[PDB]
Amino acid sequence: GAVVGG
Amino acid sequence: GAVVGG
Amino acid sequence: GAVVGG
Amino acid sequence: GAVVGG
Amino acid sequence: GAVVGG
Amino acid sequence: GAVVGG
Amino acid sequence: GAVVGG
Amino acid sequence: GAVVGG
Numbered sequence: 703g704a705v706v707g708g
Numbered sequence: 709g710a711v712v713g714g
Numbered sequence: 715g716a717v718v719g720g
Numbered sequence: 721g722a723v724v725g726g
Numbered sequence: 727g728a729v730v731g732g
Numbered sequence: 733g734a735v736v737g738g
Numbered sequence: 739g740a741v742v743g744g
Numbered sequence: 745g746a747v748v749g750g
Contacts, residue, residue, distance in 0.1 A: 704715040705714030707722030709722040716727040717726030719734030721734040729738030731746030733746040741750030
């Protein structure tokens with residue numbers, strides 16, 4: 703799974 | 709900003 | 715998975 | 721800015 | 727996976 | 733700026 | 739994977 | 745600027 707922060 | 713760890 | 719921060 | 725670790 | 731920060 | 737580690 | 743910062 | 749490590 704991708705790990706994404708915005 | 710979000711703080712995200714995976 | 716990609717790891718991406720914006 | 722987001723702080724992201726994977 | 728790519729690791730990308732912007 | 734984002735801070736990102738993978 | 740590429741590692742990219744902007 | 746982003747700070748990015750892969």
